[PDB]
Amino acid sequence: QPNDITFFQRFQDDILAGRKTITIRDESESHFKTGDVLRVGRFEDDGYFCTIEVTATSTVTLDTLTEKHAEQENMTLTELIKVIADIYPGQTQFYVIEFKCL
Numbered sequence: 001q002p003n004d005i006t007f008f009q010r011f012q013d014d015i016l017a018g019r020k021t022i023t024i025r026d027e028s029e030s031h032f033k034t035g036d037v038l039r040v041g042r043f044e045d046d047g048y049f050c051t052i053e054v055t056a057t058s059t060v061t062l063d064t065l066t067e068k069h070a071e072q073e074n075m076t077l078t079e080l081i082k083v084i085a086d087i088y089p090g091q092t093q094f095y096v097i098e099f100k101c102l
């Protein structure tokens with residue numbers, strides 16, 4: 001059973017505990033959609049750790065990321081923008097995937 005999506009393992013505990021319920025991705029992962037059931041692995045070792053159900057998707061830009069996006073990331077907004085500047089340098093167009101761990 002291959003993984004459909006991966007996360008940095010520093011997110012694993014937040015996802016399993018339900019503290020992190022969205023992910024913000026670039027055009028590479030814009031194909032996920034409400035109702036998808038996805039096997040999730042760690043980015044570093046591809047260890048499966050959960051199956052998620054996508055509950056909502058939306059587009060977002062750097063300048064329209066909100067406090068509520070940050071809360072759903074278990075982050076402050078300033079922290080979230082810094083994460084995005086590191087993982088998606090120079091990018092401004094993103095896609096929000098909201099999910100629940102099954």
Ligand SMILES: [Ca+2]
Nearest residue numbers: 082083085086
């Ligand atoms: Ca940084």
